[PDB]
Every structure is written in C-alpha cells, then in structure tokens.
Design an enzyme around this catalytic site. Structure first.
Site, short mmCIF file in Angstrom:
data_model
loop_
_atom_site.label_atom_id
_atom_site.label_comp_id
_atom_site.label_asym_id
_atom_site.label_seq_id
_atom_site.Cartn_x
_atom_site.Cartn_y
_atom_site.Cartn_z
N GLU A 1 -5.11 3.35 8.28
CA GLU A 1 -6.51 2.92 8.43
C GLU A 1 -6.67 1.38 8.60
OE1 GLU A 1 -9.16 4.90 5.82
OE2 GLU A 1 -10.98 3.98 6.66
N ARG B 1 -17.97 13.32 15.79
CA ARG B 1 -18.70 12.87 14.60
C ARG B 1 -19.85 11.90 14.87
NH1 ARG B 1 -13.60 12.60 10.38
NH2 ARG B 1 -13.67 14.82 9.77
N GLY C 1 0.82 -1.21 0.00
CA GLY C 1 0.00 0.00 0.00
C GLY C 1 0.85 1.27 0.00
N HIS D 1 -19.17 9.85 8.48
CA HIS D 1 -18.95 11.28 8.45
C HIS D 1 -20.31 12.00 8.41
CE1 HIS D 1 -17.42 15.22 7.28
NE2 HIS D 1 -16.21 14.79 7.62
N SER E 1 -6.57 11.04 11.45
CA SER E 1 -6.12 9.96 10.58
C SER E 1 -4.83 10.32 9.88
CB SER E 1 -7.20 9.58 9.55
OG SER E 1 -6.73 8.61 8.62
N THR F 1 -15.71 18.64 3.50
CA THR F 1 -14.94 18.67 4.73
C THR F 1 -15.62 19.29 5.95
OG1 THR F 1 -12.90 19.39 5.80
CG2 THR F 1 -13.77 20.86 4.06
N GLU F 2 -15.35 18.67 7.10
CA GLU F 2 -15.69 19.25 8.39
C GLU F 2 -15.03 20.64 8.48
OE1 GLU F 2 -16.15 16.46 11.49
OE2 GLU F 2 -14.60 17.44 12.77
N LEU G 1 -17.62 13.53 -0.17
CA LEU G 1 -17.44 14.26 1.09
C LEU G 1 -17.35 15.78 0.94
CD1 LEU G 1 -16.59 14.32 4.13
CD2 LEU G 1 -14.28 14.20 3.29
N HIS H 1 -17.61 6.50 6.20
CA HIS H 1 -16.41 7.30 5.94
C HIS H 1 -15.09 6.66 6.29
CE1 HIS H 1 -14.02 10.92 5.45
NE2 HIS H 1 -13.58 10.81 6.71
N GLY I 1 1.70 4.00 4.12
CA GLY I 1 2.69 3.17 3.47
C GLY I 1 3.88 3.93 2.92
N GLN J 1 -17.08 4.91 11.35
CA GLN J 1 -17.40 6.31 11.45
C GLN J 1 -18.23 6.71 10.26
OE1 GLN J 1 -14.51 10.18 11.31
NE2 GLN J 1 -15.24 9.42 13.30
N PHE K 1 -11.77 22.43 14.14
CA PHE K 1 -12.27 21.18 13.65
C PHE K 1 -13.07 20.54 14.81
CE2 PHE K 1 -11.43 17.72 10.42
CZ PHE K 1 -11.42 18.54 9.29
N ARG L 1 -13.28 8.43 15.69
CA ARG L 1 -12.05 9.14 15.37
C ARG L 1 -12.34 10.63 15.29
NH1 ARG L 1 -9.77 11.18 10.78
NH2 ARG L 1 -11.23 10.18 9.34
C1 LIG Z 1 -12.30 8.97 2.40
C2 LIG Z 1 -11.73 10.21 3.06
C3 LIG Z 1 -10.92 10.09 4.20
C4 LIG Z 1 -10.37 11.21 4.82
C5 LIG Z 1 -10.59 12.49 4.29
C6 LIG Z 1 -11.37 12.62 3.14
C7 LIG Z 1 -11.95 11.49 2.54
C8 LIG Z 1 -12.79 11.64 1.29
N1 LIG Z 1 -10.01 13.59 4.90
C9 LIG Z 1 -9.21 13.43 6.05
C10 LIG Z 1 -8.62 14.53 6.68
O1 LIG Z 1 -8.73 15.72 6.29
N2 LIG Z 1 -7.87 14.31 7.81
C11 LIG Z 1 -7.66 13.05 8.33
O2 LIG Z 1 -6.96 12.95 9.34
N3 LIG Z 1 -8.23 11.95 7.70
C12 LIG Z 1 -9.01 12.15 6.57
N4 LIG Z 1 -9.60 11.06 5.96
C13 LIG Z 1 -9.34 9.70 6.50
C14 LIG Z 1 -7.98 9.32 5.94
O3 LIG Z 1 -7.71 10.11 4.81
C15 LIG Z 1 -7.84 7.88 5.49
O4 LIG Z 1 -7.96 7.09 6.63
C16 LIG Z 1 -6.38 7.72 5.11
O5 LIG Z 1 -6.04 8.62 4.07
C17 LIG Z 1 -6.01 6.28 4.78
O6 LIG Z 1 -4.64 6.28 4.49
P1 LIG Z 1 -3.83 4.92 4.33
O7 LIG Z 1 -2.36 5.13 4.01
O8 LIG Z 1 -4.05 4.16 5.65
O9 LIG Z 1 -4.57 4.15 3.12
P2 LIG Z 1 -4.99 4.67 1.65
O10 LIG Z 1 -4.79 6.16 1.52
O11 LIG Z 1 -6.31 4.23 1.06
O12 LIG Z 1 -3.96 3.74 0.87
C18 LIG Z 1 -4.34 2.44 0.46
C19 LIG Z 1 -3.18 1.90 -0.37
O13 LIG Z 1 -3.20 0.49 -0.33
C20 LIG Z 1 -3.17 -0.04 -1.64
N5 LIG Z 1 -3.87 -1.34 -1.66
C21 LIG Z 1 -5.09 -1.68 -1.17
N6 LIG Z 1 -5.30 -3.01 -1.43
C22 LIG Z 1 -4.22 -3.52 -2.06
C23 LIG Z 1 -3.86 -4.79 -2.55
N7 LIG Z 1 -4.71 -5.81 -2.64
N8 LIG Z 1 -2.64 -4.95 -3.16
C24 LIG Z 1 -1.78 -3.88 -3.28
N9 LIG Z 1 -2.13 -2.64 -2.82
C25 LIG Z 1 -3.32 -2.46 -2.21
C26 LIG Z 1 -3.79 1.06 -2.50
O14 LIG Z 1 -3.27 0.99 -3.78
C27 LIG Z 1 -3.26 2.30 -1.85
O15 LIG Z 1 -1.95 2.51 -2.35
O1 LIG Z 2 -13.88 16.61 7.00
C1 LIG Z 2 -12.74 16.25 6.62
O2 LIG Z 2 -11.87 16.91 6.06
C2 LIG Z 2 -12.26 14.88 6.81
O3 LIG Z 2 -13.28 13.93 6.79
C3 LIG Z 2 -11.34 14.80 8.00
C4 LIG Z 2 -10.99 13.57 8.50
O4 LIG Z 2 -10.11 13.57 9.39
O5 LIG Z 2 -11.60 12.57 8.05
NA NA Z 3 -8.33 1.40 11.62
#
Ligand SMILES: *Cc1cc2c(cc1C)nc1c(=O)[nH]c(=O)nc-1n2C[C@H](O)[C@H](O)[C@H](O)COP(=O)(O)OP(=O)(O)OC[C@H]1O[C@@H](n2cnc3c(N)ncnc32)[C@H](O)[C@@H]1O
Ligand SMILES: O=C([O-])[C@H](O)C=C([O-])O
Ligand code: NA
Ligand code: HEM
Ligand SMILES: CC1=C(C(=O)Nc2ccccc2)SCCO1
Ligand code: SF4
Ligand code: F3S
Ligand code: FES
Lengths: 588, 122, 105, 238
Positions: free
Chosen positions: A388, A286, A14, A242, A404, A254-255, A252, A354, A19, A240, A119, A399
């Site tokens: 996550e 939330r 990831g 949102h 995050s 944003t908050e 989404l 969310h 990652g 969660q 926030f 959360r």
């Molecule tokens: C959905 C969301 C979440 C979010 C946000 C806005 C949205 C629309 N805004 C945030 C914010 O302002 N502040 C905050 O603290 N959190 C916020 N969030 C939550 C947060 O963004 C998410 O929890 C976070 O970004 C997750 O990050 P993480 O590094 O843990 O994971 P990811 O970004 O989805 O990366 C996933 C990677 O894994 C790879 N993957 C998945 N499955 C596989 C398999 N089978 N094989 C190989 N790779 C895999 C994906 O390719 C990706 O690279």
């Molecule tokens: O409202 C946001 O920007 C967002 O949803 C924030 C987190 O942390 O998840």
């Molecule tokens: Na988690």
C-alpha cells in the site's frame, strides 16, 4: 557515532503482507535482513483484510490472466501502468499457489481446489459475463494470509524487530538512502539501522480521515518519511472509499457480501445499482458504487436511524448456512458494531475511506523513483517500497477488490527476487556521516523538548475533519482551495505541538505524536494533489471538472517535496506479452 | 525487575475453575488422611482391646467432625475425578456450558455423599 | 514420560474407585459393628488382597498426583527433592504398614 | 452520565510498585461505547496512560485486558457490560505476564510457547500436487475453530497451569495452534510433532480447569483441541 549502529544488507520497515513476503524472499536469497514493525507483526492492518485475493487460478471456471489484466486496467480508469499490471496478473497465480503451499488455510471447492468467489470488477472475455476469481478463507483471508506469512518467517528465523518505530530515512552526502533511525518502543533506545536497501512497507493512511476502515496504526509513516527525505509521492489524490463501511462505526463489511449475492437498497427498496450500473450492478467498480450510494443519500433516498445516513445491504436471502460458512466475520462485525443481525436484517452501510492508491512511485523491482530537473525518472539509490505504501502503479485511480493482497505478495516477492541486481546496479553507497544520522533525529528532538506547545489532540481532530469535509467522495474547487488553506494553518500549529509524556518505557504518546507528523504530510500531499488535478477520474471526482480528460490528464500526478509543487509522470502503456488496452469510456 | 499481576483476589474464577482447585485441595487432604485412617485401622485390628479403644476415639465429637471432613474431601475428590475422566473418555462434552452443568451436578452429588457420610459417623 | 503418568494415574483411580464401592458396601450393610463381624471382614482373603491392591494403587496414584502439585508450587530444587523424599517414603510406609496390619489377622 | 474507572498504573522510572488510579469520564447517556473508546478518551485527558490497540474490531488481538476480573478485548467489550451502580470499572493487565508499563505486558513467553510447537506447515515434498494441495471440504472443516486464533493471550493468561509453568506448559493458545497443524491434511509430520509433545509438561499440565474457553473473544475452545491432542498422544504412545 553516539548512537548504536545495526547493519544489515536490507532493512524492511513494516511487517504486513508486503513486508513479510519481501523479508522472507530477501532472506532465502541469501542476504541479511532486519524486519521492523511498530506493532507485533500479526497485528498489522493486513490482518483485517476480509474478502480475499483476486487472481486468475481458474478454479471456479476457466479463466485467463489477460481477462484479469483487462479488468484491472479498466478498473484503474486507464492511469494504471500496463506493463506493471501485466506483470502482476500473469505472475499472480504462481505467487498465490505458493502461499497455499506455505499452509494458508484457503476455503475449498468440492474437488479440493481453492475456493474463489465473485467480487467487483470481474469479467470473462474482456468485459463479458461476471467472473469469480477472488480466492478466499471464509471472510478472514487477510488474517489467514498474515498469520501464514508470520509462521513462514518463524520457520525461516527472520530477524524481527518487533515494536520498533522508524523515525526518518538517513541520507548520505550523495543523496542515497542508507538506512533509517528507529525508536524501540519498550525501552526508548534509539538506533541507526544501516542498510544497503531500505524497503518501506508501512501500509496506508486512512486515519487522515474522520471515518476510515483502517486500523489506528495506519498513519502514513512511509509517506511522511519519503516526503521529509525529498522523495516525491504520486497520485496522492486517489483515495478509495470502500462502498460498504458500517454506518456510524467505519468498520468494514466485505465486498464479499455482494460477491456472494447480497445487494444494496435505498429507503424505497430500490436496488439502485441496476440504474447506475446496468451491467455489473452491485459488483461495479468501487469508485462508481461509492458515488452511487452518496447520490442516493444526497437526494433524500438514503435511510436514517441510530447509525446516521446510510444505505441498506441486504443479505438475509442468502440463508443462515451460507452466511455462517462464507461470511462469518461480517456476521460478528455487524452484530457488534451495528446491533444488526445480517441473517434477518440489512446492514446499514456507507462509503468509508479505505485504501490509498497513491504512494511512493516504484519500478516492478520495488526500487523507489524520483525525477531530475528535466522531469526524467531517476532511481533513488538505497530506497525501495512495496505494498500500500507504494504506487507502482497497479491500481491507477481505482483499485479492484482482491488486488491489494495480490499486490503485497507479487511485489514483496519481486523486491526480494531482484534485490541483488538492484544493489549491484546502484553501486557501493558512501557511509552516512554523524550529522547525516543526527538530521534524522530533528523531528524526534523537537517533540522531546516541547512542553508548552499546542495540544496535539485538537490538531489531529482538525486535520481529520478538514479532510472529511473537503477531500471526501465528491470534491469541489472552492472547498478544496479552502481546505488546503486550513491545512497550512493546522500544519503550522503542529510545528509547535507539545508532548506531555516524557518517559521512555513504552511511552505511546511519543509514538502517537510522531505519527501525527505523518498524518500531516500525507493529508497535505493529498490536498495539494487533489487541487492540482483538474479533471474527474476513478475515485477523484470534481463538480467543477466533471469529465475525464485524456488529452491533459492521462498521467500520474507527482508531489515534489522540496518545492511543494506538482508535476506529471507518464502512464506506462506498453505491456510485453499482449497489446496495450486503449483508453475508452468507462461505465459498468 | 518487572511486576506481575497475579493478585488472585482481583480475578474472577468461573465455577469450573473452582471445581478444579477443590479437586486439587481434596487430593492433598486425602493423601494425609490415608495415614490417619491407617493409624486408626491398625489400632482397631490389633486386639479386642484395640477395637474398643478405636470406638472410643470414634465417640469423640471432635473426632467425628474430622472424620466427616476426611470422608467429604474424599467423596469430593472421587466424584469430581470421575467427571474429569468422563471428559477424557468422551462421555462428557468439553464445551463451557457442559463444563458448568457437570461441575454443578458434581457438587450436588458430593453434598449428598457428605450427608450419608455424616449419618454413617453420628 | 507424561502419557505414562496420565494412564497410570487413571488406571489406579479405577481400581481405587472399585475398592471404595466395596468398603462402602460393607459399611452400609452390617448395622451393629461388633469386634467379631469387623475382624471377620478383614480376615477374608478377598478383603486382604483387595486392600493390599488398594495400597499399591494409592502408592502409584498419589505419587503421581503429589508430584504434579509439588512441581507447580515448589520451585527451589533442594526443598522439592526433600519433600518428594518424605512423600515417597510415607507412601511406601503406608503399603508396608498395610502388609503388617493385615497379614497379622 | 459519569463513568468511574480504577486503572492499573506502573512506570518503572517513577513507581516503586504498581498502583490503581481513579478516573472519571462524562459519557453520553443515550449512547453505548466500547471500553477502548473510553481508554482512548482517558488518554486525551491523561497522556501518560499506555495500552496497546490497533484494529479496534476484535481481529488483531492487541488489546487483551483483565476487565472487572475477567479477560477480554477492550475494543469489543461494551461499557454497558462492565458498568455497575456504585462500583468502579476495574482494568488491569492480563495476569501472569511481566508488566512493561501500565496495561502493557511482555508477551515474550506467550510467543515462545507458540514457537515451541512449530506453527508452520511441514510437508515432506513427496507426491507434490500439480497446483494447490487438494483439500476436500471435509478435511478443510477440521481447521475451523483453530485457525481463527488472534494470538491475544486472553486464554493462556487466564490458565493457572500456564501461570505456574509458562516455560514448560505450552498453554491453551499454543496447544490450539499445535492441533491446527496436527490435523491439517497437508502436514505430513504428525508423528514427529506428537513425539515432541509427550513429556509430562507440554500438553499434560492441562487438567481441564476450562478458564480458556470462557474468555476467548473468538469463541474458540482450547480444552477441546487439547483433548484431541491427548487422544492422539495415547493412540501413538500407549
Ligand atoms: C483496511 C482494510 C484493507 C483491506 C481489507 C480489509 C480492510 C479492513 N481487505 C482486503 C481484501 O480482502 N483484499 C485485498 O486485496 N485488499 C484488502 N484490503 C486492502 C489491503 O488489505 C491493505 O492495502 C494491505 O493489507 C496493506 O498491506 P501492507 O503490507 O502494504 O501494510 P500493512 O498491512 O498495514 O502493514 C503496515 C506495517 O508497517 C508497520 N509500520 C508502519 N509505520 C511504521 C513505522 N513508523 N515504523 C515501523 N513500522 C511501521 C506496521 O507495524 C505494520 O507492520
Ligand atoms: O471488501 C473487501 O473484502 C475488501 O475491502 C477487499 C479489498 O480488496 O479491499
Ligand atoms: Na499505494
Ligand atoms: C485414595 C486416595 C487418593 C489420593 C490420596 C489421591 C490424590 C490425588 C492427588 C494428590 C492428585 C493430583 C492433584 C492435582 O494435580 O491437582 C490426584 C489427581 C487425580 N485424582 Fe486422585 N487420589 C486418591 C484417589 C482417587 C480416586 C478413587 C479417584 C477416582 C475418581 C481419583 C481421581 C483422580 C484423577 C482422575 C486425577 C487426575 C487429574 C490429573 O491427571 O491431573 N483419585 N489424586
Ligand atoms: C494448576 C492446577 C490447579 C490450579 O492451581 N488451580 C488454581 C490455582 C489457584 C487459583 C485458581 C485455580 S487446580 C487443577 C490442577 O491444576
Ligand atoms: S484461542 Fe482465543 S483467547 Fe486464546 S489466543 Fe486465540 S483468540 Fe485469544
Ligand atoms: S484454562 Fe488451562 S488447564 Fe487446560 S482446559 Fe484450560 S488450558
Ligand atoms: S484492537 Fe485489534 S483486537 Fe481489540
């Protein structure tokens, strides 16, 4: 070996925030590291994160990491591990300043320091006046963070396997995890990535629901992989929702909108968050805000129209200039997906699945945990998780916005700082045998040989509808038991599902079928866990057990894949640098 | 070996891009045209007989047509080249809008020069 | 280097634009084009110099420009160098032929 | 209402060369979907159709396509903007890049040009700040219009200069990135960066065709960034 073998000290599955941070760190610490991602790294869900990073920089006003600790422990409704939350809030400032030196384009105050906005869940003096501690790049912070991290990975020459799909963990005869198999999406080639440390960083799984803010790629591949390897997952019932997804679209907003002064209105123009949370109002936690909106709707005070049932999020009083400068991103999203211009009209919003509080349980070092027959924690040799996908747990039952991104960076980094110690502690691991590897491929092989089975599209829709109706914001004993039953049926159908595209060059059907197995394990684990916890805490709410039960449920819930049954783990309440925050009534 | 989508007939080109490809074509044409104009000039200057001979060549309707093409391609390369340089020097904005307006004005100016050229040659 | 091209191509384009304004001026303000008023214009020191200057400018400006076109559309090295050879010689011929036509007036 | 598509297909183990295939989709009349909604639905009925997508909100840059001849993202292109009485909606891969399969292009050469201009903060470490680098709002605004790039390649794959020399010309997106670091007050390698952009091809192949600007889904302006780079190049080398 009839399968190519690619060996590294570490394989990071990831390339989102978590990652890419870990890879960077593992690499600088001198070990070899393959970074796998099923999409080009900058397309991971982190790219969509809007509001920013919650961290006590103390730029917008005097702050204190202990205030941030309090907010987080309280926010988690007291099942967040306090030693881990302590580690996060105290380490945070340094970790985030470090991102700024990698060039992250933060927004700025007049004096040149990083801009921080209010926030939800933010207070001064342990529950006092509203704070502003979320560091931001307009409302594109996740975009800024992810690109900055990719750039740092280019600069370090990290070895990146872009568009490879990890299939399943590989275990040796001692039960140690020794790497995983992966499918190269372009060519179809399947490989064994051999590693002393396999770090799951696969993100969340909002797509188990019918409506989610999550990208299509959030299919809980990490959950499914752990489960199939016999590794337990924790607090899976803690989803969660949102408060402000766009009604009728799930996208989404944003908050940050509320942090900048926006607020929520019902069909009568009541700012109802004053009634439900007299102190923090629209910046309450939330779980509370989401429930409040859904009560307003259930009681016929929600609004209607093209978008379906919803509440109004009023921003127009902030002005064009502030909107375009601090919130340009939601301006685009609202105009495109709601056909509403936030400068002149309120945005139609509704709670939307969310973020996944649950996941693979880990230590602060990122090492994955399991339990033995006496219920004691035991490290899973060779396995790690960050972000996550992990459940450290720093978020407990709810959360905080901003926490995050902080988590990805703090814990990705920590797994890397500690990898050498972790590898030494676990000892040399015995090689996977040929059938150890072959076992990883069973799931892939079934799909390749099934031509006349069931339609996976119908299975996915049933799965998602089941979760939406039975494991959403408000839950019920009866409905959950029935949902669980339907999942069992659906899950049986899936063991017979067909793959219609049999080709090998960029065949995305195969990928999406593989993904669906992971939606299924995640949904199932969630449901079993949600039935099990007979109380109401944070995001988990039940009419049949409306109360928080600190005598019986001050603990994590743990799903055991071998027996498919539930058990409990202690919540940690022994911070090292200050006293534990004791459980108390939680209102906003 | 992998195919590529570069079927020009399936891609939309905005006015600015049309303007640009024409600038390139007009430049190549002008490069050949210089030789021709030189060939003609040298004839017209070698003696009084050479001059009448040049007038007689300029008499031909076919030659007038080509000479008009040459002058038009040249006017085009020049005008649109000046547009280019006004952008390079900050006299013209580089937004898409500004780019559309300036291309159009360039066409208009060229059509006018093309007539003044047609008149001069008739 | 490319900054060098960028500038020379533009410097010469300015010179050539002046020369065109000059020649257009003449052509647009003489009416009856007798052999005598023609030869008189091109006998002038001003016209001789300006014209030779223009030829040098075309040498530089068109060399740069044709180079740009070729390096977009002509990939095989041998065919390209040959076309450059032809084009360069042609341009040099232009200047030389220009010298012989005007010094002869 | 019936919707009709002509979609580009190519699978190297089946097809001798690419081909266009016809597709039909019953749509709800009173409701307007995005092209990506349609694509996802087409796949339910033809599982072999491959295309990239992810965020479905115009942020991740996965689903750049050539739609009715013009580049953009499927996820924010409404059907209503593509639909014409008695014509098909024509969907093809971004131009100029090798096609892996169906609508999926190999972006390698696009990512290579991005790496060539060194897209990461280069800071010589002298005069370290006490905490974050101090960047005044005026200096920070200089990054607006540059850092928002989602690396979708809509611009570069619509640039003729990039088609003819994808390995020499950096292309609009890359040069947009280069400028992002050239004007970041926190980057101290400005001169050294400019010395690597002085050859005939890196920047100078851009001749204001201006196809970049009209296609950018984020409303960014490569032409203008490139213009600024050109000035800096002259200020330094002329
Ligand atoms: C959905 C969301 C979440 C979010 C946000 C806005 C949205 C629309 N805004 C945030 C914010 O302002 N502040 C905050 O603290 N959190 C916020 N969030 C939550 C947060 O963004 C998410 O929890 C976070 O970004 C997750 O990050 P993480 O590094 O843990 O994971 P990811 O970004 O989805 O990366 C996933 C990677 O894994 C790879 N993957 C998945 N499955 C596989 C398999 N089978 N094989 C190989 N790779 C895999 C994906 O390719 C990706 O690279
Ligand atoms: O409202 C946001 O920007 C967002 O949803 C924030 C987190 O942390 O998840
Ligand atoms: Na988690
Ligand atoms: C006198 C005969 C001339 C010839 C034979 C000629 C030829 C050319 C050629 C072949 C090109 C390159 C085309 C391309 O890259 O697409 C070019 C570019 C250019 N032309 Fe001319 N030209 C002439 C005069 C002029 C004049 C008077 C101007 C003034 C407006 C001018 C303006 C320009 C400019 C500004 C470019 C630069 C674009 C770039 O750098 O790519 N040209 N010319
Ligand atoms: C590469 C380039 C041009 C180009 O080839 N334009 C073009 C070619 C084919 C189809 C459309 C436009 S015209 C301006 C000079 O630079
Ligand atoms: S500048 Fe625009 S079109 Fe070009 S890569 Fe970035 S977002 Fe895509
Ligand atoms: S479309 Fe291409 S030529 Fe320059 S202004 Fe543009 S990068
Ligand atoms: S799918 Fe993420 S940009 Fe269209």
């Amino acid at each position: 070996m009839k399968l190519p073998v690619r060996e590294f000290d570490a394989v990071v599955i990831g390339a989102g925030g978590a990652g890419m941070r870990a890879a960077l760190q593992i690499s600088q610490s001198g070990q070899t590291c393959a970074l796998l991602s099923k999409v080009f790294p900058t397309r991971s869900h982190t790219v969509s994160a809007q509001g920013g990073i919650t961290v006590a920089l103390g730029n917008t006003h005097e702050d204190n990491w202990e205030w941030h600790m309090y907010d987080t422990v309280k926010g988690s409704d007291y099942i967040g591990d306090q030693d881990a939350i302590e580690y996060m809030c105290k380490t945070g400032p340094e970790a985030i300043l470090e991102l700024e030196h990698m060039g992250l384009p933060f927004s700025r105050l007049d004096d040149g320091r990083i801009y921080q906005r209010p926030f939800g869940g933010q207070s001064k003096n342990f529950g006092g006046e509203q704070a502003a501690r979320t560091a931001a790049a307009a409302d594109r912070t996740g975009h800024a963070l992810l690109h900055t991290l990719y750039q740092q990975n280019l600069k370090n020459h990290t070895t990146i396997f872009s568009e490879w799909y990890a299939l399943d963990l590989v275990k040796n005869q001692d039960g140690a995890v020794v790497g995983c198999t992966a499918l190269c999406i372009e060519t179809g080639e399947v490989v064994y990535f051999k590693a002393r440390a396999t770090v799951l960083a696969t993100g969340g799984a909002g797509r188990i629901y019918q409506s989610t803010t999550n990208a299509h790629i959030n299919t809980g591949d990490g959950v499914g992989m752990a489960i199939r390897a016999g590794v337990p997952v924790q607090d899976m019932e803690m989803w969660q929702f949102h408060p402000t997804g766009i009604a009728g679209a799930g996208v989404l907003v944003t908050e940050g909108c509320r942090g900048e002064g926006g607020y929520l209105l019902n069909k009568h123009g009541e700012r109802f968050m004053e009634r439900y949370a007299p102190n923090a109002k629209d910046l309450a936690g939330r779980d509370v805000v989401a429930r409040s909106i859904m009560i307003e709707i259930r009681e016929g005070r929600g609004c209607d129209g093209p978008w379906g049932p919803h509440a109004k999020l009023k921003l127009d009083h902030l002005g064009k200039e502030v909107l375009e400068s601090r919130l340009p991103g939601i301006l685009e999203l609202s105009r495109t997906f709601a056909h509403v211009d936030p400068v002149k009209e309120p945005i139609p919003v509704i709670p939307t699945c969310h973020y996944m509080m649950g996941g693979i349980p880990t230590k602060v070092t990122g090492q994955a945990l399991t339990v033995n027959e006496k219920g004691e924690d035991v490290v899973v040799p060779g396995l790690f998780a960050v972000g996550e996908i992990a459940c450290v747990s720093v978020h407990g039952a709810n959360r905080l916005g901003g926490n995050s991104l902080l988590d990805l960076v703090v814990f990705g980094r920590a797994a890397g700082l500690h990898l050498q110690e972790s590898i030494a502690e676990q000892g040399a691991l015995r090689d996977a045998s040929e059938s150890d590897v072959e076992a990883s491929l069973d799931r892939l092989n079934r799909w390749n040989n099934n031509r006349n089975g069931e339609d996976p599209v119908a299975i996915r829709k049933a799965l998602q509808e089941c979760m939406q109706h039975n494991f959403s914001v408000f839950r019920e004993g009866d409905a959950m038991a029935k949902g669980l039953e339907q999942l069992k049926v659906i899950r049986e159908r899936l063991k017979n599902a067909r793959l219609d595209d049999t080709s090998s060059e960029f065949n995305t059907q195969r990928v999406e079928c593989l993904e669906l197995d992971n939606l299924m394990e995640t949904a199932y684990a969630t449901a079993v866990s949600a039935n099990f916890r007979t109380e109401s805490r944070g995001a988990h709410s039940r009419f049949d057990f409306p109360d928080r039960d600190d005598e019986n449920w001050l603990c994590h819930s743990l799903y055991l894949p071998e027996s498919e049954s539930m058990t409990r783990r202690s919540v940690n309440m022994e911070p090292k640098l200050r006293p534990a925050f004791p459980p108390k009534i939680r209102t906003y | 070996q992998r195919p590529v989508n570069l079927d020009l007939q399936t891609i939309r080109f905005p006015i600015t891009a049309i303007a640009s490809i024409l600038h390139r074509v007009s430049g190549v044409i002008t490069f050949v045209a210089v030789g021709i104009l030189l060939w003609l000039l040298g004839t017209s200057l070698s003696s009084p007989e050479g001059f009448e001979q040049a007038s007689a060549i300029m008499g031909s309707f076919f030659v007038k047509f080509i000479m008009w093409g040459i002058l038009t391609a040249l006017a085009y390369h020049v005008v649109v080249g000046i547009r280019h340089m006004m952008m390079d020097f900050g006299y013209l904005e580089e937004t898409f809008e500004a780019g559309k307006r300036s291309a159009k004005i360039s066409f208009v100016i060229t059509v006018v020069l093309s007539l003044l050229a047609g008149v001069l040659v008739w | 280097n490319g900054v060098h091209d960028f500038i020379l191509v533009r410097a010469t384009a300015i010179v050539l634009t002046l020369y065109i304004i000059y020649m257009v001026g003449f052509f647009a303000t003489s009416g009856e084009l007798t052999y005598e008023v023609w030869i008189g214009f091109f006998a002038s020191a001003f016209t001789k110099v300006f014209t030779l200057l223009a030829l040098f400018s075309i040498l530089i400006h068109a060399w740069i420009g044709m180079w740009q076109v070729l390096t977009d559309y002509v990939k095989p090295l041998a065919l390209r160098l040959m076309l450059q050879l032809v084009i360069v010689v042609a341009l040099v011929v232009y200047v030389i032929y220009g010298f012989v036509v005007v010094w002869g007036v | 209402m019936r919707l009709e598509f002509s979609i580009y297909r190519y699978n190297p183990d089946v097809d001798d060369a690419p081909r266009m295939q016809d597709y039909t989709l019953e749509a709800d009349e009173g409701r307007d979907m995005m092209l990506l909604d349609a694509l996802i639905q087409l796949k339910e009925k033809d599982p072999s159709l491959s295309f990239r997508r992810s965020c479905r909100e115009g942020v991740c840059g996965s689903d750049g396509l050539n739609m009715n001849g013009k580049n953009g993202l499927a996820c924010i292109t409404p059907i209503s903007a593509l639909n014409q009485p008695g014509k098909k909606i024509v969907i093809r891969p971004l131009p100029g890049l090798p096609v892996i399969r169906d609508l999926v292009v190999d972006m390698g050469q696009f990512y290579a040009q991005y790496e060539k201009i060194k897209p990461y903060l280069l800071n010589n470490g002298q005069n370290p700040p006490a905490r974050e680098h101090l960047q005044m709002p005026e200096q920070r605004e200089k990054l607006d219009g540059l850092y928002e790039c989602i690396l979708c390649a809509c611009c570069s794959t619509s640039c003729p200069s990039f088609w003819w020399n994808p390995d020499k010309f950096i292309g609009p997106a890359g040069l947009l990135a280069a400028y992002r670091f050239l004007i970041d007050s926190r980057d101290t390698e400005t001169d050294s960066r400019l010395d690597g952009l002085s050859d005939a091809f890196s920047v100078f192949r851009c001749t204001s065709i201006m196809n970049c600007v009209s296609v950018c889904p984020k409303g960014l302006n490569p032409t203008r960034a490139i213009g600024h780079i050109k000035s800096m190049l002259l200020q330094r080398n002329a």
